[PDB]
């Protein structure tokens, strides 16, 4: 069991530090739609 240092953006909000992530790079030029952009219906 070992750890690897890597750099990512962090927001500090209410005594919690949270990682901020943006999965654009996974779905770019791929055939699969990014699931974080969706359709929301209203009647």
């Amino acid at each position: 069991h070992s750890l690897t240092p890597l750099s990512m953006d962090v927001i500090r909000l209410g005594e919690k530090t949270v990682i901020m992530e943006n999965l654009r790079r996974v779905y770019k030029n791929t055939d699969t739609k990014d699931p974080l952009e969706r359709n929301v219906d209203l009647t």
Partner: protein
């Protein structure tokens, strides 16, 4: 008499393409056999993730 004081000429300032800031948008190349070629192509190969 009529006096002719100094006669002057247009001391024009020149412009050079590579001194222009627009040249940043260009990668300028000199080729002496340009009169001979008529086609220039660049081929791209890309496999999607």
């Amino acid at each position: 008499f009529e006096a002719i004081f100094g006669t002057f000429c247009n001391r024009l300032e020149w412009v050079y393409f590579l001194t222009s800031g627009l040249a940043a948008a260009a990668h300028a190349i000199k080729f002496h056999d340009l009169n001979k070629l008529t086609t220039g192509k660049m081929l791209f190969h890309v496999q999607v993730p």
